[PDB]
């Protein structure tokens, strides 16, 4: 019941080829050719795009192919289109008559250059809640890490899903609710790059 490991986000320009990885263990992905890929547009049910590692259901565009090497399966999308923008899930037989999904990958087809995130960290009558405000980022995926001084904190954290601003960029917020407050840092990483704010 440990999900398959997928990239949180992947981005590409129209006409390019993109590859989404799905890493499992030798006891599922790598013991079987029972790996499937699903495309999900917001508000709709997932759709089978690839099954048995590399086979295509009829109706599915030939721009979608699949491959597997070791414990890692890969979905490749060629000649990227705007509509290919969606969430993608790998899925494998997990042994013992069970099924396991990957964590999911957001595919973004760039209609604008990747930008920012701008991070505003507020340390705030209430004297405890630390507030990490994230805005104007594209593509719309970020992960948030909190630090007390130079040591991690993962407890008491609530983060929003990214939401779309009018300028087709994204906004999000992460909350750190505390008692201990008497420096702190909010670390947001976007497209492998980390943006850091300290108070």
């Amino acid at each position: 019941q440990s999900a398959l490991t997928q990239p949180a986000s992947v981005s590409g320009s129209p006409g390019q080829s993109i590859t989404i990885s799905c890493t499992g263990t030798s006891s599922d992905v790598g013991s079987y050719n029972l790996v499937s890929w699903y495309q999900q547009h917001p508000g709709k049910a997932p759709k089978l795009m690839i099954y048995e590692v590399s086979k295509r259901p009829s109706g599915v565009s030939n721009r979608f192919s699949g491959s597997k090497s070791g414990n890692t399966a890969s979905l490749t999308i060629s000649g990227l289109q705007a509509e290919d923008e969606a969430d993608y899930y790998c899925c494998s037989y997990a042994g013992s008559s069970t099924v396991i999904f990957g964590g999911g990958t957001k595919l973004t087809v760039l209609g604008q250059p990747k930008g920012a995130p701008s991070v505003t960290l507020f340390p705030p009558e209430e004297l405890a809640t630390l507030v990490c405000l994230i805005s104007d980022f594209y593509p719309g995926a970020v992960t948030v890490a909190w630090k007390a001084d130079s040591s991690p904190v993962k407890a008491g954290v609530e983060t929003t899903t990214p939401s779309k601003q009018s300028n087709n960029k994204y906004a999000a917020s992460s909350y750190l609710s505390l008692t201990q407050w008497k420096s702190y840092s909010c670390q947001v990483t976007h497209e492998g790059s980390t943006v850091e704010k300290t108070v």
Partner: protein
Amino acid sequence: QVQLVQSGAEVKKPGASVKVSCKASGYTFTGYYMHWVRQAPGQGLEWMGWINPNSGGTNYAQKFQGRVTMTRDTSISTAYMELSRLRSDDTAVYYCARGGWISLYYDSSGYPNFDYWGQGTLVTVSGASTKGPSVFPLTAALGCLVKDYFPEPVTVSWNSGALTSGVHTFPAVLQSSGLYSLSSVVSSSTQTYICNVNHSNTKVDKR
């Protein structure tokens, strides 16, 4: 043509139960495994288990073992999923999906090949009751922080509607308590800024 049609959205309190139906048509119901997959808002797909509609045999994911029951009624080609002792994090869209062809001689229950899906059934689990928000103050950056309110939505303005440029009101976060929190943000100045907030019959004003 294969159709999977699920029951309508459900609203429940913690501790209660929900039972979602999945009516199959366009194929022989007893010939294929039926799977259940759920998806919490903004989160990933999560396999729950399968049922053999021909035999009534089930398996369930470890995580739901003890809480979930999958049943079927072959006379009306309908499968059921009942989740008990609901918690706030059971809030999700629940999907039924047709899996592999049922064979004696091969166990195809674990084939992750879901060719047809139900439209999904939202069930929202919340024990929270109506509560008014608390409002707190946060190139120069400014804003106010509004903690622990319920339910959606709230309308926030600054200087009673006078300011719009550079103004940003963030979407609420849903906490594990069942409560929402957001922030709205917009030195040079010789200025009074008030964020005017409307909800609980709540109207507050804050610099």
